[PDB]
Design an enzyme around this catalytic site. Structure first.
Site, mmCIF file in Angstrom:
data_model
loop_
_atom_site.group_PDB
_atom_site.id
_atom_site.type_symbol
_atom_site.label_atom_id
_atom_site.label_comp_id
_atom_site.label_asym_id
_atom_site.label_seq_id
_atom_site.Cartn_x
_atom_site.Cartn_y
_atom_site.Cartn_z
ATOM 1 C CD1 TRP A 79 -33.701 34.955 -22.088
ATOM 2 C CD2 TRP A 79 -33.057 33.044 -21.392
ATOM 3 N NE1 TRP A 79 -33.792 34.157 -23.260
ATOM 4 C CE2 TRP A 79 -32.485 33.004 -22.820
ATOM 5 C CE3 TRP A 79 -32.864 31.826 -20.794
ATOM 6 C CZ2 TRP A 79 -32.014 31.947 -23.734
ATOM 7 C CZ3 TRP A 79 -31.607 30.482 -21.820
ATOM 8 C CH2 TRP A 79 -31.714 30.845 -22.841
ATOM 9 N N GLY A 113 -26.505 32.891 -15.926
ATOM 10 C CA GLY A 113 -26.859 33.903 -15.680
ATOM 11 C C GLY A 113 -26.255 35.405 -14.968
ATOM 12 N N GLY A 114 -25.232 35.198 -15.551
ATOM 13 C CA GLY A 114 -24.328 35.985 -14.722
ATOM 14 C C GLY A 114 -24.163 35.588 -13.327
ATOM 15 C CB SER A 195 -24.438 32.175 -20.165
ATOM 16 O OG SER A 195 -24.331 33.050 -19.549
ATOM 17 C CD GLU A 322 -21.311 33.730 -27.361
ATOM 18 O OE1 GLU A 322 -22.346 34.307 -26.591
ATOM 19 O OE2 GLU A 322 -21.221 32.839 -27.653
ATOM 20 C CG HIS A 435 -25.430 34.732 -24.114
ATOM 21 N ND1 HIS A 435 -23.816 34.269 -24.110
ATOM 22 C CD2 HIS A 435 -25.626 35.207 -23.348
ATOM 23 C CE1 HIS A 435 -23.620 33.998 -22.964
ATOM 24 N NE2 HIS A 435 -25.091 34.874 -22.280
#
Ligand SMILES: *[C@@H]1O[C@H](CO[C@@H]2O[C@@H](C)[C@@H](O)[C@@H](O)[C@@H]2O)[C@@H](O[C@@H]2O[C@H](CO)[C@@H](O[C@@H]3O[C@H](CO)[C@@H](O)[C@H](O)[C@@H]3O)[C@H](O)[C@H]2NC(C)=O)[C@H](O)[C@H]1NC(C)=O
Ligand code: A1A2O
Ligand SMILES: *[C@@H]1O[C@H](CO)[C@@H](O[C@@H]2O[C@H](CO)[C@@H](O)[C@H](O)[C@H]2NC(C)=O)[C@H](O)[C@H]1NC(C)=O
Ligand SMILES: *[C@@H]1O[C@H](CO[C@@H]2O[C@@H](C)[C@@H](O)[C@@H](O)[C@@H]2O)[C@@H](O)[C@H](O)[C@H]1NC(C)=O
Ligand SMILES: *[C@@H]1O[C@H](CO[C@@H]2O[C@@H](C)[C@@H](O)[C@@H](O)[C@@H]2O)[C@@H](O)[C@H](O)[C@H]1NC(C)=O
Ligand SMILES: *[C@@H]1O[C@H](CO[C@@H]2O[C@@H](C)[C@@H](O)[C@@H](O)[C@@H]2O)[C@@H](O)[C@H](O)[C@H]1NC(C)=O
Ligand code: SIA
Ligand code: NAG
Length: 526
Positions: A79, A113-114, A195, A322, A435
């Site tokens: 990621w 990715g928040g 996400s 998740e 998740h």
């Protein structure tokens, strides 16, 4: 080989996929580089070029901190960005079927990715399979993350907030003016994301400036009403000012602060972004979407409640586990390298991690609702409880509440429950269906026979890809040919959803119903 876009010609590359040919245009700019004076401002329209842009390599990813919690471990490093980090990062990718399509549905991917990290160039976002197998055109774009993409002095155009969202939106505009050159139908565009990407898609449903830029929407493990998704104008200010102190940019003129943060190097801003929050959790969106008055005209939970969104079809869903991945990012007693059986005291210490500013009664109320055992001597009880707590609270219940409220305005909605654990999953088995690990099935990586997936996985990817593309093409995620289970509409009353696995694909009702009543009706009071 060469396509004439409205700002100039671009050259692509040819790719062999599954005994066929896909054309990839990698790294096409869609805005002026947001450098110098343009840092923190909204993206600016790109000046024409008269050359041939060589869209033959992924462009730079946007500046971002990196997950360095498991160096060398593929389960976490897959990621992390796989191109140079740079402030010059507003580029996009086009995968078109070859031979060139006539009027193809477009799929636009928005990575998660928040809101702090992510890049379209990741291996699990490669759209060549979707182009090849379904003859759709796949678009993805890089958008600014962290404070560089979401720093907020509300009202101030030097840092108005939501820049990364406006980045995404400028990309969607790019597809509108240009995708027809590539054989694509601009009247048939589906956003899909996961996400923070899925919460982004949900916000494009809300933002009026995006309403004419896409047709349909897919939301994978994410929606705007999740507790991490939106920052308040309060916190956005306190965080914008904390960043100013941490860099010595505290000024009395707000505009002078911004000018000051423009002369700092990207690493200085990145290095201080973690500390703008006093108590952080592993789900800490230090600089995220805000109600800016521009992209977002009111608080989004009010728009949702009062029907103030694009009327169209949505495909929404979540994964079975998740919340398990976040437990090894801080929770006591946990590790990806043991079974992480924890105790009652360890469970309680973990709630203080994930619910830092919550009252003792609130944390007691979470423990109460999640520790009524079907068996008290089961040693995994507290380990599995905390994962469900994080997962239900952060992803599963907000996604269900969004689908409920959105469908209540008469649009077709389809909910899935992805419950298949990848055979090649590098994380331990107590983490389950993690998740982010449907994404590869959506993009059709199990279709390549050469990378050690099972046959059952190739079939599950095949069905998911068909359903996904039928949703984009026809607003209906069916697989009509292979005696597939019919996917029913999600309705507020009956609340039917489709399970996705390699064994039986089933129609179930009212996912995590008891757990979500707590999270959605009670806990928002504490
Ligand atoms: C699973 O692993 C975690 C993480 O610990 C780390 O990873 C393991 C696989 C091993 O390689 C460990 O050596 C490594 O540190 C374990 O959690 C840890 O448990 C230890 C048990 O001794 C705790 O250490 C003690 O903590 C207290 C704090 O009050 C001190 O008083 C003591 O001096 C002592 O250091 C440690 O805090 C704890 N750490 C974390 C981050 O959870 C866990 O026990 C293990 N579970 C298993 C094997 O089932
Ligand atoms: C590291 C900082 C720069 C940011 N940071 N800090 C804690 C933390 C925890 C996660 C959760 C997570 C990690 C690995 C994974 F395999 C699946 C997961 F869910 C993520 C994350 O989501 N990473 C990418 C996965 N997709 C879904 C976006 C990021 C996190
Ligand atoms: C529906 O089922 C058929 C089989 O009846 C699938 O066709 C397979 O296609 C792949 C890729 O071309 C081949 O490797 C297989 O050999 C085919 N199967 C057979 C029995 O020949 C088709 O992919 C299925 N569609 C789905 C699941 O969406
Ligand atoms: C842009 O691309 C031009 C052509 O690329 C080269 O030729 C084709 C046929 C392929 O084989 C490709 O891989 C080659 O690199 C270059 O001639 C031109 O210089 C490029 N422009 C740049 C680098 O600014
Ligand atoms: C391309 O098709 C256009 C109509 O689009 C149709 O409606 C939208 C809502 C989508 O669901 C899509 O599948 C449909 O085709 C025509 O107006 C246009 O002229 C066509 N252009 C071509 C064939 O070049
Ligand atoms: C708003 O900010 C206040 C100051 O932030 C903290 O203290 C200074 C010294 C900086 O180092 C900063 O990074 C620290 O986190 C907080 O005291 C106050 O609680 C904040 N209010 C919130 C978060 O609601
Ligand atoms: C971050 C960045 O600007 N990267 C650039 C790279 C590197 O500077 C060099 O390869 C040395 O690392 O050079 C290019 O000419 C290239 O070959 O693609 C353009 C590209 O944009
Ligand atoms: C802050 O500075 C800007 C120009 O940088 C100016 O327009 C504004 O009036 C200033 N405000 C003050 C000094 O209060």
């Amino acid at each position: 080989i060469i396509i004439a876009t409205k700002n100039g010609k671009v050259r692509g590359m040819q790719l062999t996929v599954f005994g066929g040919t896909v054309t990839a245009f990698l790294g096409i700019p869609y805005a002026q580089p947001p450098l110098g004076r343009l840092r923190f401002k909204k993206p600016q329209s790109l000046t024409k070029w008269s050359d041939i842009w060589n869209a033959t390599k992924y462009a730079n990813s946007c500046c971002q901190n990196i997950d360095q919690s498991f160096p060398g471990f593929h389960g976490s490093e897959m990621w992390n960005p796989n191109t140079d980090l740079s402030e010059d990062c507003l580029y996009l990718n086009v995968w078109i079927p070859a031979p060139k399509p006539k009027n193809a549905t477009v799929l636009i991917w928005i990575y998660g990715g928040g809101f702090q990290t992510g890049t379209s160039s990741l291996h699990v976002y490669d759209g060549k399979f979707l182009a090849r197998v379904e003859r759709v055109i796949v678009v993805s774009m890089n958008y600014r993350v962290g404070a560089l993409g979401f720093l907020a002095l509300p009202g101030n155009p030097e840092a108005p907030g939501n820049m990364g969202l406006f980045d995404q939106q400028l990309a969607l505009q790019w597809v509108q003016k240009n995708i027809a050159a590539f054989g694509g139908n601009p009247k048939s565009v589906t956003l899909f994301g996961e996400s923070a990407g899925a919460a982004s898609v949900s916000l494009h449903l809300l933002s009026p400036g995006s309403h004419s830029l896409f047709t349909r929407a897919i939301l994978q493990s994410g929606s705007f009403n999740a507790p991490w998704a939106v920052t308040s104008l309060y916190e956005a200010r306190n965080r914008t000012l904390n960043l100013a102190k941490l860099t010595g940019c505290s000024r009395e003129n707000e505009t002078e602060i911004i000018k000051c943060l423009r002369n700092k190097d990207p690493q200085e801003i990145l290095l201080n972004e973690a500390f703008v929050v006093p108590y952080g959790t592993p789900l800490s969106v230090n600089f995220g979407p805000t109600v800016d008055g521009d992209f977002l005209t009111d608080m989004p939970d009010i728009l949702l409640e009062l029907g103030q969104f694009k009327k169209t079809q949505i495909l929404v869903g979540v994964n079975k586990d998740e919340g398990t991945a976040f437990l090894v990012y801080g929770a006591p007693g946990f590790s990806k390298d043991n079974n992480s059986i924890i105790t009652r005291k360890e469970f309680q210490e973990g709630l203080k991690i994930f619910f830092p500013g919550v009252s003792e009664f609130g944390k007691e109320s979470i423990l109460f609702h999640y520790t009524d055992w079907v068996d008290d001597q089961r040693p995994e009880n507290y380990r599995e409880a905390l994962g469900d707590v994080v997962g239900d609270y952060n992803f599963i219940c907000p996604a269900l509440e969004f689908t409920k409220k959105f469908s209540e305005w008469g649009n077709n909605a389809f909910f899935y429950y992805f419950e298949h654990r990848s055979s090649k999953l590098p994380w331990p088995e107590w983490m389950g269906v993690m998740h982010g690990y449907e994404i590869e099935f959506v993009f059709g990586l199990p279709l390549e026979r050469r990378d050690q997936y099972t046959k059952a996985e190739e079939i599950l990817s095949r069905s998911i890809v068909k359903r996904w593309a039928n949703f984009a093409k026809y607003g209906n995620p069916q697989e009509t040919q292979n005696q597939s289970t019919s996917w029913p509409v999600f309705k507020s009353t009956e609340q039917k959803y489709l399970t996705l696995n390699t064994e039986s694909t089933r129609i179930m009702t009212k996912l995590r119903a008891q757990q979500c009543r707590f999270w959605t009706s009670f806990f928002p009071k504490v």
